[PDB]
Symmetry: C3
Subunit: 345 residues, 3 copies
């Protein structure tokens, strides 16, 4: 019945994104994706705390899927028999059947094939949703990612001008709820089922123990900082399937930001900090103007610095002293300074 | 002095809305409403937990009032002598005197009549606000609802096109703060005054025990699901007088969303999830495209699935396989599948 | 190298703002500011609770700096040797070097001079950010303020009309994390270093003990209410460097609101409540229409009434009974009232 070309896409692990065209003159296709559920213990902080995670394709977040408006997206969801739980998938980009969840419930040892038409442009969350209390549990165990539905003509500024990125990164933010014992130390378990009761008690209090990018504190710092160059226009997709976030690029801005993440709306310009409402993806474009290290955070700085939610960019290029300069390096306060006469003393 | 026709409105219990015109060619009127405060014990979850509630017109939320720009709204607020506390009303739609609170304080056995001019379009919270710590306590005990001030020409898309709904529902979301005893079980009390001290201690920690629509977990599921039909344009008004929320229609979208709730602003288009800042109402229009069950949640899924904040729509009509289809039903993973060669293993 | 006139600005304590032009025909200048770090114990609530604070210029928030687009801002940051900790400054308005933090780290006894070009219009947070866990700690200890970068032609409505304020106020909101002892009473310390470990434990749970405007509960009530007059257009700048807020003017509205705080975007009109994402400043214009007391809150009313986050305006002028009137003062419910036949009983 649907007589369109079929194109298989090979996903890649975040924060990288599978190759794609921004603008295209190709017509609609059936874009074929495979997502394999993997339950596994994972390391989620710099002290080595482990967690009974649940993932699409082995990562937190699940990988970013990219299609264009009018494409059909045919997803083979696989639940290997080494897993212990049923799983399914809800695409916030899709129309009907709880975004697909009501058509994709699979037990370990099964797979299912769902097709949805990409009628809505933007970045959108996808996540597991088995039913009842299992919905938040699978999501906050790691079972969420995002899909981007680009306009066929690529992005624009809402005022008739095309916008093109030189580089794209996907930042999935994950709130985690890790039990502690009476001594205050994080607990370890041998299976997700064994971890559940204690984890639900932490979840109920709506305060995460960790807030991480790309699955762990420090994932996108150190050697895995995100690269860019002065002059590049970088698209930063940010998702949060369960909980609000407030992204900020330290030392930069959001030149064009779709806070609610939907490209039929013009972006806002020149933001300091934006807001990803829990259950959504948003996107920001920034053209780098200065070299050096940038931090990229949620701007609850307690979350950023103390619960894991800091990434880095390492940007190559030449410094622009017109934009910013250190006029005088740190020096002893002059002896003839008169600061004791200032109004606030 | 004010020589306009008077029109008495009979309110109805949420999530339904009293009948009204969208567009009107009638001129301004004095629209007369009566709100009667009722303090009473109410059931707020599926396990039968009770709560010492305070309400306008016996419901959480209070009923939705609907008027047009330029109408005058004359509210008779009644505090029967069976109540124990003073009460008043703040209309976020109104100008002056703390939205009316400073002109409406009534003791049990009294009533008061306030008139406010509907100069500002949108959906707006109304709530009790007696003074001091009694303000949050009366609000989170249930004393809040909403008023909609429509443009006289009805809604529009911000780009010169009229928008008309076939159906309207009012979803009032309530954060509740229910004390627990040392064994961890919710406590019961014989009066609101007796519940207050323990409730304030829960309030102070800014973590609700329950987050509910229409006054209780499960209120809008089961037999009280919200009805719609494929093709209908449904307006979903959502209020939260004290605390943020992030609404999402599972399997749908917000075609047109006034997140901040004010019709002088164009709506955003094609949202997955929107954001109701605490202390406001917002509104979303969606044209149903597929039949079946939809969930409507706050997309903190812990709140949705575990604290009470899930409603259902039951939508009649014919399924559209172009928008979404199950290409292959659940089946055993083929023996010749090669998933062990995937990049993430 | 930079051959522009230099203009020294004398800052003033919030909520007031140093004098400035809205529109200007002067060209770019080097606008010179001095900020002096002051660590000190401060009183943060109406019961006299003290706190080991860290400030710019002795206040929470730090003072509002005002410049125009294209100016250069040359900041001398001073860390007197009476302080105990290193400090620095991040301007969210600036481009490069972590907003300046990477060029301004100074030990007690030192000062540094940073210049940044004001290329981005709006209101923006500035805050200390020494590194690692010290970043949130210095911020939530009080080391944050804001800078406003006005367009050279002043504000406009996004639709080609100039907007001019008669009056400006800066409301800095501060989330505080004050330890308690086993008896539940706030603890006192002799230095910030001594307070740190216990404070970090409170911070980690992401629930403030206090949420205050201008540094303390009650700061902007009583004799320090904010003054205005009927007819004045008042700009209310609101910042929150670490945590979301939802401002609301009780009895008023936001006529024009830049929620994300950036003047290249048109303001929203007629808001009831707006949203300051943590890590940002926003701004609202309101033309007062009625005299009397107004409250200005975050509309988590628990925070507003119970944790400190209420300010007042005292507005002089004549009451407008067309906008609002008390039709009938409180009176006993008429004996012939029939409220027992209402639908909700
Ligand atoms: O150690 N993780 O369960
Ligand atoms: O669920 N959000 O903060
Ligand atoms: O601006 N750095 O938090
Ligand atoms: O049982 N409610 O107080
Ligand atoms: O008060 N809001 O999350
Ligand atoms: O999309 N359902 O959470
Ligand atoms: O009393 N303050 O540390
Ligand atoms: O960090 N904000 O609620
Ligand atoms: O509208 N006063 O919360
Ligand atoms: Cu799952
Ligand atoms: Cu969802
Ligand atoms: Cu009341
Ligand atoms: Cu209010
Ligand atoms: Cu500091
Ligand atoms: Cu910052």
């Amino acid at each position: 019945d649907l007589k369109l070309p079929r194109q298989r896409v090979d996903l890649v692990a975040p924060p990288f994104v599978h190759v794609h065209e921004q603008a295209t003159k190709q017509g609609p296709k059936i874009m074929e994706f495979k997502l394999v559920v993997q339950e596994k213990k994972m390391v989620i902080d710099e002290k080595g705390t482990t967690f009974q995670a649940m993932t699409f394709n082995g990562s937190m977040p699940g990988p970013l899927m990219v299609v264009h408006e009018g494409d059909y997206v045919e997803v083979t969801l696989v639940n290997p028999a080494t897993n212990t739980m049923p799983h399914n998938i809800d695409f916030h980009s899709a129309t009907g059947a709880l975004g697909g969840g009501a058509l994709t419930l699979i037990n370990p040892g099964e797979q299912v094939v769902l097709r949805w038409k990409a009628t809505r442009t933007g970045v959108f969350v996808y996540h597991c949703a088995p039913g009842g209390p299992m919905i938040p549990w699978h999501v906050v165990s790691g079972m969420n990612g995002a899909v981007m539905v680009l306009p066929r003509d690529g992005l624009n500024d809402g005022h008739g001008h095309s916008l093109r990125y030189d580089r794209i990164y996907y930042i999935g933010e994950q709130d985690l709820y890790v039990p502690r014992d009476e001594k205050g130390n994080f607990k370890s378990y041998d299976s997700p089922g064994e971890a559940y009761s204690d984890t639900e008690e932490v979840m109920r209090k709506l305060t995460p123990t960790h807030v991480v990018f790309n699955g762990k504190a420090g994932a996108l710092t150190g050697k895995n900082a995100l690269n860019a160059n002065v002059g590049e226009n970088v698209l930063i997709v940010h998702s949060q399937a369960n909980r609000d976030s407030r992204p900020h690029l330290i030392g930069g801005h959001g030149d064009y930001v779709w806070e609610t993440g939907k490209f039929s709306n013009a972006p806002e310009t020149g933001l300091e900090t934006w807001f990803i409402r829990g259950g959504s993806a948003g996107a920001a474009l920034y053209k780098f103007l200065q070299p050096g290290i940038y931090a990229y955070v949620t701007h609850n700085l307690i979350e950023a610095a103390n619960l894991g939610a800091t990434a880095h960019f390492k940007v190559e290029g030449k410094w622009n002293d017109d934009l910013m300069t250190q006029v005088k390096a740190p020096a002893d306060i002059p002896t003839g300074s008169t600061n004791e006469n200032l109004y606030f003393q």
